[PDB]
Amino acid sequence: SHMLRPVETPTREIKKLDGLWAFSLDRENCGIDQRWWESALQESRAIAVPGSFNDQFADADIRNYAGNVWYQREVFIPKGWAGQRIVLRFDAVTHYGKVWVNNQEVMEHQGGYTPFEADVTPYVIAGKSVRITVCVNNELNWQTIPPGMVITDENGKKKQSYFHDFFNYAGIHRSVMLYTTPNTWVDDITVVTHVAQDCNHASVDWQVVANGDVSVELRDADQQVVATGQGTSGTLQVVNPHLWQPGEGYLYELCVTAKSQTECDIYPLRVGIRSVAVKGEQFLINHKPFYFTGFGRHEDADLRGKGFDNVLMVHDHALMDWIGANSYRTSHYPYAEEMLDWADEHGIVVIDETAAVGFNLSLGKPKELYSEEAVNGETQQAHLQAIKELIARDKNHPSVVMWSIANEPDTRPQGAREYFAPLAEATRKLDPTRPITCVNVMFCDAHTDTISDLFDVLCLNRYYGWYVQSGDLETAEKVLEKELLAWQEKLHQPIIITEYGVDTLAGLHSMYTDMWSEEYQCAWLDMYHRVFDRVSAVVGEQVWNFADFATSQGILRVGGNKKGIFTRDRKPKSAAFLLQKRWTGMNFGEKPQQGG
Amino acid sequence: SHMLRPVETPTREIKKLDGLWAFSLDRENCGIDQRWWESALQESRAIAVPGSFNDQFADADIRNYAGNVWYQREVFIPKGWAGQRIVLRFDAVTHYGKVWVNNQEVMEHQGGYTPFEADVTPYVIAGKSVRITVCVNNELNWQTIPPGMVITDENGKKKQSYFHDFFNYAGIHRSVMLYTTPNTWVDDITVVTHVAQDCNHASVDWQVVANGDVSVELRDADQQVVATGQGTSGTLQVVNPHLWQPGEGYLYELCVTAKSQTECDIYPLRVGIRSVAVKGEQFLINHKPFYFTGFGRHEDADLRGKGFDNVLMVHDHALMDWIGANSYRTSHYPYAEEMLDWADEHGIVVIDETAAVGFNLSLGKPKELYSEEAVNGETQQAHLQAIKELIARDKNHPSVVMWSIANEPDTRPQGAREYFAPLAEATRKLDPTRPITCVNVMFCDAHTDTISDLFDVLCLNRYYGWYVQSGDLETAEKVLEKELLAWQEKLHQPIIITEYGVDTLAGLHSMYTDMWSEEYQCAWLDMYHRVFDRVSAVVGEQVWNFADFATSQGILRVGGNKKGIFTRDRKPKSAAFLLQKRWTGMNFGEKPQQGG
Numbered sequence A, B: 001s002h003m004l005r006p007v008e009t010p011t012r013e014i015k016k017l018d019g020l021w022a023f024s025l026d027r028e029n030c031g032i033d034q035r036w037w038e039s040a041l042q043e044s045r046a047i048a049v050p051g052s053f054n055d056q057f058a059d060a061d062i063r064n065y066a067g068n069v070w071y072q073r074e075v076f077i078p079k080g081w082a083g084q085r086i087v088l089r090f091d092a093v094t095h096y097g098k099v100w101v102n103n104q105e106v107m108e109h110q111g112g113y114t115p116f117e118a119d120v121t122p123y124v125i126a127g128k129s130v131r132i133t134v135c136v137n138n139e140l141n142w143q144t145i146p147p148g149m150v151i152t153d154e155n156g157k158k159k160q161s162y163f164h165d166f167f168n169y170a171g172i173h174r175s176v177m178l179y180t181t182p183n184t185w186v187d188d189i190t191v192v193t194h195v196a197q198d199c200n201h202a203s204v205d206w207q208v209v210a211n212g213d214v215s216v217e218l219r220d221a222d223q224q225v226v227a228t229g230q231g232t233s234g235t236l237q238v239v240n241p242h243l244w245q246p247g248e249g250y251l252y253e254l255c256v257t258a259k260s261q262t263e264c265d266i267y268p269l270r271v272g273i274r275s276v277a278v279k280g281e282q283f284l285i286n287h288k289p290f291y292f293t294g295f296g297r298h299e300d301a302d303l304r305g306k307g308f309d310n311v312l313m314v315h316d317h318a319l320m321d322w323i324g325a326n327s328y329r330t331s332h333y334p335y336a337e338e339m340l341d342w343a344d345e346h347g348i349v350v351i352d353e354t355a356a357v358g359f360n361l362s363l364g365k366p367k368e369l370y371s372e373e374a375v376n377g378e379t380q381q382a383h384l385q386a387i388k389e390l391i392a393r394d395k396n397h398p399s400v401v402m403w404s405i406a407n408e409p410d411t412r413p414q415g416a417r418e419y420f421a422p423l424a425e426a427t428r429k430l431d432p433t434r435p436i437t438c439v440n441v442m443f444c445d446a447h448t449d450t451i452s453d454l455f456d457v458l459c460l461n462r463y464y465g466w467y468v469q470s471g472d473l474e475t476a477e478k479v480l481e482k483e484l485l486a487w488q489e490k491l492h493q494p495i496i497i498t499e500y501g502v503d504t505l506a507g508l509h510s511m512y513t514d515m516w517s518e519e520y521q522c523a524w525l526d527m528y529h530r531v532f533d534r535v536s537a538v539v540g541e542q543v544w545n546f547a548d549f550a551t552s553q554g555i556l557r558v559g560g561n562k563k564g565i566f567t568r569d570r571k572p573k574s575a576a577f578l579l580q581k582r583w584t585g586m587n588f589g590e591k592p593q594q595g596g
């Protein structure tokens, strides 16, 4: 469908992101048979929402649970809600959610990281209390996005195995809410912003107003109307603009009005006037070459598996700001929209990424990745859908300068191309206004990768000197430089190293500057930087990883992934100061001149 | 002011605690002078509420700030709230708040741990946006609770000094809510439980109807009316008992119905039928011997400081339950009421405490602690006032067994007894239903301590082996026993050890089992246990602290305070398993055989 972001004015929100909900596991999978949504959840403990369910109770068995869990909550419809359009929305429900308003199934969703909502007007009475039961599923398979394989052992007990390097946290990770609109309501806006050598431009609009004529006005930061439009559908605005720019992100405001004969609806959409374009080996923003700095991030913290939190967001952005990061990539799933609102407001450049990681069977059972058994026509449709829902969500955020379709598919087999070519094309139809990318795994190098020509920007995840040439900066450096030059000459695209990093145990110090030591982390990033500055095609550097985060258990992960610049409690490792010096020492948004 | 916990029936609330407010420091103390409240705060930045302002920005200069900070936020008033009573409520604003609604000063408060509310109907228009501005002050002085001294440097800036161990986190710590009520409504209730030998017994209501009559029906957990009164001012209700017990904590519900010609206000309260009193050396729960287990705790966590957080609350309770805690004390300030509903609902026992800590000058410039210079009549009032507001809030929470009037005052100076006798008086009258205490410091020991006799239960914070007899279990054991026995003689009052603990560095291990080693914590906690058991008078153990927590900087505090059984990120130290084993190897609410 269509997704607008709930704002208040004529339209109003009840939070119900009030956190305390009833919660129980459904170990027997009785829940649907017995219609638990029909009465109060039995044997139910208190849980916080928004939040992962896994870590809230410090219990291994709830953490490692695979299958169905139930959230239940009673809530009060505002009396004043009367005959307005009432909508129940979930910003996210991890992997799968099915929702009941009082023994009435109102919605269903597969996707752990984007919103789903249903008009509930007919199913609720204003001034009365309703029971809300969500059945949440955390299972992955070959058609889920990201993919996985549940293994049931001989006892019929499920266990989730998956192919990506973060932990499969689940639950209601983001805001759930009740919200209002008039029976005439704006429900889709699409803004495209053009700029022409930065003295003037046009901002096209496209508007869907469920039964309403629309009018448009564009306002300053200091709230004065600078352009108007009728053409309630397709209306183009000309301006002497304050451009939304990486440093500051100046935001205009577009007010969308849906008028019925008796009814009004008012939707304000923040707009940054900026162009994004690749020209040759450059990534241009408002027609200037940009240089990315900053991180691949995760949504991860102690006690919240991936649950959204405002303090964590305020804090992490103070860190990213302090360190001189100008960008990030929503590694491995769409992030909370609050994050993109922040980025828009603060002029943070973002690479927006679907949840399509784990397409790889060689990261470290089926023998063909592209297979009817394993990655197939159904998967591709699920993949396209994931792309659709992400673009439908994030299309108007000026902070998003690029779409990332997938992280680290195995592109060696013939068929990778078969599978990805249509997604690349589809994606571009969905959004013509942004470069497109597919993040690239180390072993699909310049000579073996089959897919990268189909996208606009080259985003490489590189670990030379870590997973390969381990401990050896000297030969690490040679392989890295040779690889990046090969890519440059092969594709003549802008290259962003979207991942480079080494596990570092905070407090592990070594005179020998060897693996897993603060000093090795320092020397290794430093060597990588030396190379980047020698390669003109390199247009960006995003360190892996903002902070330590949880993964599945194994021999390769010491209590988790330790490639953070900060620890999970947001303590700086000495590499944090190193990056601070490089990033705050550069000219903003500008690439070093390959010397101090 | 009259104080009721807002809840949703015919009554509605919108949390403005939706987190992102605009924030600013007023370093130049211009804020009040320039009516900053009249316009958008400039030089503003985003901050999350509910949370301490100190640690959200990873900035030392903000963390150590003393003076006024400004919080601002705009909020659309809901359309269905139009001739209703609207109340603006802050559950806590740490130290001091001054609130404006569009250039209309609406409220002021001293005390960082209790709610304050005002009707804003006249200053706000329904369906319109109003601007909310708050002035938050963190400064402490002799009149304040807890006290402090603020020094203005030779350069001109302010630095805070204070005498309690934990860190001075300030800002809007708990939720802010807009709040609805009919023009005729309830703003007060009080309930008492009598239970004689667990046969059927009574609950006396006393209520305040702001212009209405009340029907007052008591419902069982099944909403089955088991008693009724119409005397809106004084009643009694009697049925086969069904005790609120510490094991499971069963609750009843009391609908408070308040009637006017046009409007009815239904207010709901939760009631736990239980009895608390001392007979000689025993704390009796429903006329039966209780033995406390669990912790002294703080409100402290990684990036929010003392800011409330549901996930943290869910998680901490999981851990206390797991470890066998049945009780805790709201250390050195009153906690978020959410914590008390949890304890009410899960049947946890709570020693409730005021913010009155740091009366002492010997813990580690004025000559006389109780004097015009230090602690005076004015200070005794605020102490009184703080005690008023606490009981006003928590009087109805069944989980509260006892008031702690203060933590660790120095009672050796002249006038200590004069100071505490009248406050003891005023409190006994304010709640006759619950016993009353004052938590005692090591150096005011049995022979030296005045003012132990005015309280019903002896609450002792003891550190032998750690501050004295440093590292010496053998002598510390004797001093402790002789001490505890010397306490049974002077008084035959129930003894609870409210604090016993040792700093311990997670990961510090020693074959020598010496100070600041995981082993020592175990050995020492073990030692207090052997002694504890031998003393018939000892009614309880509350370990200091539950988890590591921040303190102001100094040579005695390494991370901050390290006496936590868990680290600040909630990871167990080996002593978590020691306590686990004792506290679950017990019979519930009972004392060990002074042997196995």
Ligand SMILES: O=C(O)[C@H]1NC(=O)[C@H](O)[C@@H](O)[C@@H]1O
Binding pocket: A164, A165, A166, A407, A408, A441, A442, A461, A499, A544, A561, A563
């Ligand atoms: O193994 C790593 O340290 C990282 N490398 C990668 O190439 C992946 O894109 C990341 O998910 C992963 O966390």
Ligand SMILES: O=C(O)[C@H]1NC(=O)[C@H](O)[C@@H](O)[C@@H]1O
Binding pocket: B164, B165, B166, B407, B408, B441, B461, B499, B501, B544, B561, B563
């Ligand atoms: O110094 C301590 O280990 C603790 N002992 C005490 O007696 C105080 O009550 C606490 O605030 C303090 O943190």
